[PDB]
Structure formats: C-alpha cells, structure tokens
C-alpha cells in the first residue's frame, strides 16, 4: 500500500528487457519483407547477444573514449602521425578509404537484412550491425582525417571520396565492398557481407592491417581497427544466424550453396589481390607473406572450422575454393604490375621494391625476381620515378604486347600475357557490345545474369582521351592545381605535374578493338 513497499535497490538489466523483445512483433497479413528473395527467415530465430538500444550505446561509447584518447591525446603528443614510413602512410590513403565504402554499404546491407528477418531478435541483431557499420564508416574516415592533419602528405588522405573515382582499382572495390553487399537476394548479400566478408576475411584483414601498420610505424590504424574487431565478432554471429534462420526452408537446400559459392568467389576475386598488393608493396618492413595469412585464415580456419560447423545447416565448402588458393599466391603480384603501371590514375604515392624488398619477395615467392623483379627493374631503368622521362609503364605494356583488360564482372584488371595467377581471357560479342571475362566463375555469372553486370570500365569511359586531361578533370591534383596527388616515388622532391604526365602522351585505347 501507501506505507509499505520493498525498498531494496534494483534496476533492470539489458537481458531482462531483451527476453520480451521477440514479443514486440505482431501478426498482420502485410508483415513481410519488401525485398526479392528465394528464402524465408524463420519466425522464431533468436540472436546471440541480448542487447537493447541503451546497452548498445553504453558498450560502444566506452570503446570510443579509449580510442579517441589514444589518438587525440597520446599519439599527437608523440607526433606519431609523421613517424609512419611514407610507403605505408601512402598505402593507408587507399586501405582506409576502400574499407570505408565497405563499412558504408554494410549499413545498407544490414538494414536490408533487418527487413528480411521476421523474428524481432533477428531484426535486432542486424540493427546492432547497422549501427556498428556507421561507427566503422566514421572510424575509417577518422584515420584519413587524422593523417590529413598530422602526416607529411595530406593530399589523397583528404579527398579520396572523389579522387578514388579516377582509377581502375576503385572499380573492383565497389564490386566486393559496395555493390556486392546490397544488390541481390538479401541472403546472397548476407553471404557476401557476413558469411564471407566478415566471417572469412575480416579476421585476416584486421590482423594483417594492424600488424603491417605497426611494423611500419603506424599506430593510428591499430588503435581504430582493433576497436573495429570487437564489433565485427558480433557480425560474424549475424552471418551464422542468417544460415540458421533459413535452414528449414527447402529453398535453402536448392539455392544456398550457389549463393555462397558466388559470394565467396566475388569477395576473394578482388579482396585477395588488392590487400596482398597494398600490404607487401605499400610497406617497407615486412610482417608475414600475405599468402601465409590467407592460407591460415581463409583456407584453414574459415574453409575448415567455420564451414565445417555450418554443415549442420546444409552449408558446403565453396567449389571455387581451390581456384582461389592458387590465386592467393600470385594474384596480388599480378595486380601490383597493373597498379604500378597505371599509377597516375591512383591517389597514392608508390615505391618500387628496393633491393631488400626484392630479396624478401624472391625468398617468399620464389619466381618473383625473374618475372616481376625484372619488369620493375626495367621500368626503373626507363625512368619510372623521373618526371622528365616521359615514361609511364602502362605504355610499355602496350608496346610489348602486354595488354590490360577489365573483367566485366569483378572489374579486376587482367594482363593475360604476364599473369601467373588463375584466370584466362574470354572475349564475347553480345548485341553489338564486346565483353572481356577472366575466369570460369565470373563468366558463368555474366552469361546467366547479363543485366546485373553492365559496369562501364576505365578504357570505355576514357577511350582516346589523354591521361593528364582525365586526371585534371577528376581533381587528381594537389592544392597548387598542377602537381599530381599520385606519384611513382615517395621522396619529397621531383614530384610529377600534369605537364610531366602530358609529356608521356598516354592515350587510352579500346583493348577489345583487336578482337
């Protein structure tokens, strides 16, 4: 009554509220996902982390305070933003912004999954991921924001959201980390984002990114991405629960391993070579060959352990896993060829492997020296680094029959005459348009699904235009309006200008005209 009440101090803990969450949803005929899908996520699917809105915020705010303390107080006092090796400081312009678009699109992908789920707990797991991917978007931004303030070359750290549009390396990133996350069956997007991008690739990504960064004097990136890792553990649990939620739908047995095989090939096709390249070539000090990192996490831990436990819900190991393992050894070296050859279309300053780097490459990738090593040394000899040389190696490739093609599906560059990786050129004409495909899995995707894969490539956009005009149009210059953001060396002097590019006369051809 009005005089006697239990006055023990009590609150309400998150899991006390969370146990009633499933009952917040109610039945009505129109309570059904809006997105096209072959699958139905089960009504009673639970989630693993019993988090409510207030507990989510408390959790993450506490992570932020630690992270921002380290960055804005301690690392600034140390001057650590300019104690990064230039090779690595340049590589983070690309690594952080490319990863940022994967964080950003993962907000939209997680919302789409939230829409596909019918159980309130499953919607809630995806919602927590929606919020985290906003956090991660702004964390990647904050890396490049901080470099822009404290590192000796802010250009490209300070404008990648527009300067990325100049180059072909960004197109491939959009497939794996943007479009591959949000365009298709929500379940296909889930295996792209959660079962593969997160449960397969986010552990090796974070371990490698933070280990390569700290090896090269970068303590900004470990501070952020070690915080990102704590969130990403929960997202792998979302990918697991997507497979659980559809396990008893008969459509799962018809379709799921097709979506997973396609998604795994999609992710590995670019994620494998682009990170391998950015790590080993954008570094001075070497940590562990990317191939070993890929083997341990992708082949053994994910393809073995993760995929194995998922057999309880009908998951098979991807048929394209063998082909992807052969790619993991050479495909990033192949990509390095194109990335160095087309350096003026990027937004980072590049360094050819020195003698120590070449010994490292040859010792861990025996065969590198006689092939890539000879090529890189020839380019250096021809004036790769020298702004008076009129030399850009993309033109050397053309002169010597080493044509560059773009996979219509993955946007990954392909140089068949020099590639040691998996893959082979197929050139088809369909309805008055020529298409280059570069592997059995993507070619199947294009032949069955031609309307999903209509991306214009850089040779089609830039055909017959001169390189310096393309760069200037795309704002690929420093604040003086003439010096390039991108450079073929990491020294403080003899930086290339639009005029030095124009001297070379690089004009884009149509690589398929000959077929």
């Amino acid at each position: 009554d009005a005089l006697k009440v239990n006055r023990a101090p009590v609150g309400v803990e998150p899991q006390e509220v969370h146990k009633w969450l499933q009952s917040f949803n109610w039945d009505f005929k129109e309570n059904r996902t809006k997105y096209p899908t072959k699958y139905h996520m089960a009504n009673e699917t639970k989630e693993q982390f019993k988090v409510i809105a207030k507990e989510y915020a408390r959790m993450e705010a506490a992570k932020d305070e630690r992270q921002f303390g380290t960055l804005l107080d301690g690392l600034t006092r140390l001057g650590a933003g300019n104690k990064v090796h230039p090779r690595w400081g340049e590589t983070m312009k690309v690594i952080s912004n490319f990863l940022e678009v994967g964080e950003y699109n993962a907000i939209a992908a997680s919302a789409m999954l939230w829409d596909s789920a019918t159980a309130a707990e499953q919607k809630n797991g995806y919602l927590a991921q929606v919020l985290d991917e906003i956090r991660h978007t702004h964390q990647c931004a904050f890396i490049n924001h901080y470099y822009s303030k404290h590192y000796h070359d802010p250009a490209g750290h300070n404008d990648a959201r527009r300067t990325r549009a100049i180059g072909p390396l960004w197109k491939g990133m959009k497939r794996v980390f943007a479009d591959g996350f949000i365009s298709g069956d929500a379940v296909e997007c889930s295996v792209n984002l959660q079962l593969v991008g997160e449960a397969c690739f986010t552990n090796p990504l974070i371990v490698a990114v933070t280990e390569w960064a700290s090896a090269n004097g970068d303590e900004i990136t470990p501070t952020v991405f070690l915080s990102v890792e704590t969130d990403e553990l929960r997202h792998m649990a979302n990918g697991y629960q997507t497979v659980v939620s559809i396990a008893n739908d008969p459509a799962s047995a018809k379709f799921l391993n097709t979506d997973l095989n396609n998604a795994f090939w999609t992710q590995q096709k670019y994620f494998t070579p682009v990170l391998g390249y950015l790590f080993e070539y954008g570094s001075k000090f070497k940590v562990e060959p990317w191939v070993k990192t890929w083997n341990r996490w992708v082949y053994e831990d994910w393809g073995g352990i993760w995929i194995g436990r998922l057999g309880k819900y009908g998951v098979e190991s991807p048929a394209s896993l063998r082909d992807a393992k052969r790619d993991a050894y050479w495909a990033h070296h192949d990509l390095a060829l194109a990335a160095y050859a087309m350096w003026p279309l990027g937004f980072a300053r590049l360094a050819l492997p020195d003698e120590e780097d070449q010994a490292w490459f040859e010792a861990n990738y025996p065969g590198w020296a006689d092939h890539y090593g000879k090529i890189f040394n020839e380019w250096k000899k021809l004036g790769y680094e020298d702004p008076k040389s009129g030399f850009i190696p993309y033109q050397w490739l053309l002169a010597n029959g080493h044509d560059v093609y773009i996979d219509r599906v993955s946007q990954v560059p392909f140089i068949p005459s020099l590639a040691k990786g998996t893959g082979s050129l197929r050139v088809h004409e369909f309805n008055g348009k020529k298409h280059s495909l570069t592997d059995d899995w993507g070619e199947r995707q294009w032949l069955i699904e031609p309307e999903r894969y209509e991306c214009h490539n850089v040779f089609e956009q830039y055909e017959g235009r001169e390189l310096s005009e393309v760069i200037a149009e795309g704002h690929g210059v420093r604040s003086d309006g003439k010096t390039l953001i991108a450079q073929p060396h990491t020294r403080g002097d003899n930086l290339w200008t639009l005029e030095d590019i124009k001297r070379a006369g690089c004009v884009f051809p149509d690589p398929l005209a000959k077929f």
């Binding site: 009554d1 006697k4 009440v5 239990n6 101090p9 009590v10 309400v12 509220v17 009633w20 917040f24 949803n25 109610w26 009505f28 309570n31 809006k34 997105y35 096209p36 207030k54 915020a57 408390r58 705010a61 104690k83 990064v84 230039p86 950003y104 907000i107 939209a108 992908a109 789409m112 829409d115 919607k123 809630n124 906003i134 956090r135 978007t137 702004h138 904050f142 924001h145 822009s148 303030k149 070359d153 250009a155 300070n158 404008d159 959201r161 527009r162 549009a165 497939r175 943007a178 479009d179 591959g180 365009s183 280990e211 090896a215 004097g217 000090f285 999903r452 209509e454 403080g492 002097d493």
Partner: protein, 387 residues
C-alpha cells in the same frame, strides 16, 4: 613482443631518414571541398559527407558509370526509382544536431547509465507508494504498455529506408531515428518490468498490452496507420514523412505527451515522467533532422520544390486523415480514467488536441503549404470522446 616501427631503434631511424623535411601539401582539411552548411566545415560533415559512392546520374554524386553489380532484373544498388521526390543534390541534408556515430552513442550512453542509477535510487526511495493504483494497474500498465507497439512499428518502418535512401547524412538521420524508436519501446517495457519488482501481483508480461494493441478499439486506428507506414509503402521519403512528420507528430505526441506524461502528473505518478522525458527528448532531436530533410532540402529545392510539395501535400492529406482517425479511436480511453477537471474532461482533451494540432500546423503544415483548419481536426477527434 612484436617489433614496432614507432619504438624500434633500427626502424625508427630508417623511417626518420625516409620522411621528407617538409609537407607535400598544405591542405589539411579532410574533404575540404564539401560545401559547408554553417560558417566552418564541421567534423560531422567531414566524417559523413560523400561516404555514399553515388554516380553523377543520382543527383549530387561525384562518381561515374553504372554500378558493378545490380539486382536480378536490373534494379540498381541505389536508384532514382526509390522515391517520388526529386532534388538537385541528395547530399544537401544536414542533421542540425550534427550527429555522427560518436556523439550519438555518447549521449545515449549517458542516458543508459543514468537511468539505472535513477532506478536503483527510486526503488530505494519507495516513491512508488503514492501512485494512484487504478492508474498504475488499469491505464499505465495496460495502455502505456500497448503503446510500445506503436514505437516498435515505427522503428521497423525504417528497415527499407536504411537500405534504399540516397545519401549518407540522410542514412544517418534515419538509422538514429530508428534506434530511438525501438529505444522508446524498450524503455516502456523496462518501466513495466521495474514496477513489477516494486508492486506484488503487477504483471509485466506483454500479453495484455499486445492483446490491447492488436484488438482494442482504442488502438485499432493507430495500428492500421503504423501497419501501412511500415509494410504498405516503400518510398523511403514517404515513410520518413508519414512516420515522423504526420503520424508520430500528432498521434504519437498526443499519446506520449498529452496522455501518459501529462496525466501521470495528475495521478501521482513520479516514475513515468522519467521515461517520457527520454522519448520526448528523442522526438525533438528527430524532428530537427526530419525538418531539415523535408523543409530545407526538398520542399524548398530550387528546381523541384513545387514538385515535391505536390507529393508531400498528398501524403499529408492521406496520413493526417489516418492519424485523426487514430486519435478519434484513442480518446475513447478517457472514458476509462478518473475525471480530473481541465485534464480528462472534454474541455481538457480539447485543449490537449489544440496544442497537438496547433503545434503541428506551425512545425509541419505551414512549412510545406498544407492548409489545415485546427478547429476542424480537434472537433473531428473530439467526436470520439464518450458522453
């Protein structure tokens, strides 16, 4: 221990020799080229703006070409087909609160921790002893409980918005608005769970509240509106407008502020105002951002303003009628409460409705050129007040 280039002598020396003795550019403002909304470019705009990789054929985008991978059939990753409204730049929107992820979770974390200290102390105080028992058990537990399903339904209407919408700042506004709505629903349940610890026999199960939400006439109008805004449409601007600017600003404001918060301070309820304080704080934060999107950016677009106001007026006409009927159904709850002159009598409900509709006319209707006769709306709803 692993070697670190910051502290390892050999590597620190190699790095120091490699670092040039001067900056290679003086432009240190991250994404300097964003057009600032206010006097100086803000951290909020730097971290958020142009994260979305739109091409030039989605208004405002900086990229080019088709998407790399589209839906079966050809639906683009993001496309102009996603909404009826049109603008010269989808990136124009700015949250006046300037919320990127960090300040957003920082503020809600304060509320998260302070709430539990409050509850531990309120239970220690014994302050529940003075609540009107009829209010506590027959009105608050049942009908405030049932109201969580409005907040929850409004939360879920955002799922397709988060997927479909066309810019980064808009995406941030919608996702934070969504979390705040499911927060409201979870806080209503937290309050009921809390009381169940202080009042023996008080049932905090959602059974009866859900029964009320799904079948009681008092909520059938609101439920029909919520079901339509959530699962009936996919135009993500329609969802945002109908959700926050019409339904939640009329029905939801009346239910939360004029009924449960106001009448709590008429029936001796020292607890519920702590919880409605948070939902109403979230309402005003959400309103600032909704207002900027639909008023500043869309209704006043230099090329498509008249166009967009045509659709906004048509949506408002429709969703206002739905909300008026929701309130007509709802004010039948007054027949269940103890009479309090000036609060629960017909005059009192009239003034409550005049505030809600009067404020709405100022806050929303007049800004898009939607004509509304406040007395007509008040009288329409009051027709549901029992004699």
């Amino acid at each position: 221990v692993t070697k670190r280039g910051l502290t390892d002598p050999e590597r620190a020396a190699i790095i120091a020799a490699a670092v040039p003795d001067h900056a290679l550019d003086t432009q240190r403002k991250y994404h300097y080229f964003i057009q600032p909304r206010w006097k100086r470019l803000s951290e909020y705009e730097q971290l958020s703006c142009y994260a979305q990789p739109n091409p030039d054929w989605i208004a405002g985008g900086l990229d080019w070409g088709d998407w790399t991978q589209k839906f079966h059939g050809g639906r683009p990753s993001w496309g102009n087909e996603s909404t009826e409204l049109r603008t010269t730049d989808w990136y124009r929107h700015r949250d006046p609160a300037r919320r990127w992820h960090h300040p957003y979770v920082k503020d809600k974390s304060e509320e998260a921790r302070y709430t539990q200290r409050f509850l531990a102390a309120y239970s220690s105080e014994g302050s529940i002893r003075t609540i009107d028992p009829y209010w506590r058990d027959e009105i608050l537990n049942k009908y405030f409980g049932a109201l969580l399903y409005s907040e929850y339904g409004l939360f879920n209407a955002h799922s397709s918005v988060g997927r479909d919408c066309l810019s980064d700042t808009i995406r941030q506004t919608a996702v934070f608005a969504a979390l705040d709505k499911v927060d409201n629903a979870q806080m209503i349940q937290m309050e009921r769970l809390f009381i169940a610890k202080l009042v023996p026999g008080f049932d905090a199960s959602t059974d009866v509240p859900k029964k009320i939400w799904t079948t009681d006439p008092i909520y059938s109008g609101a439920r029909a509106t919520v079901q339509e805004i959530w699962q009936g449409v996919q135009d993500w601007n329609e969802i945002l407008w109908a959700g926050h600017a019409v339904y939640d600003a009329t029905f939801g404001q009346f239910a939360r502020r004029e009924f449960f918060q106001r009448l709590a301070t008429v029936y001796g309820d020292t607890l519920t105002p702590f919880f409605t304080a948070q939902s109403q704080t979230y309402f005003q934060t959400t309103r600032g951002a909704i207002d900027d999107l639909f008023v500043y950016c869309l209704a006043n677009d230099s090329e498509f303003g008249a166009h967009n106001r045509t659709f906004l007026n048509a949506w408002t006409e429709h969703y206002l009628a739905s909300s008026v009927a929701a309130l007509k159904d709802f004010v039948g709850l007054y027949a269940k409460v103890e009479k309090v002159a000036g609060a629960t009598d017909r005059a009192g409900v009239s003034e409550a409705l005049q505030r809600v509709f009067g404020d709405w006319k100022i806050d929303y209707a007049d800004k898009i050129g939607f004509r509304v006769d406040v007395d007509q709306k008040v009288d329409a709803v009051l027709a549901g007040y029992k004699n």
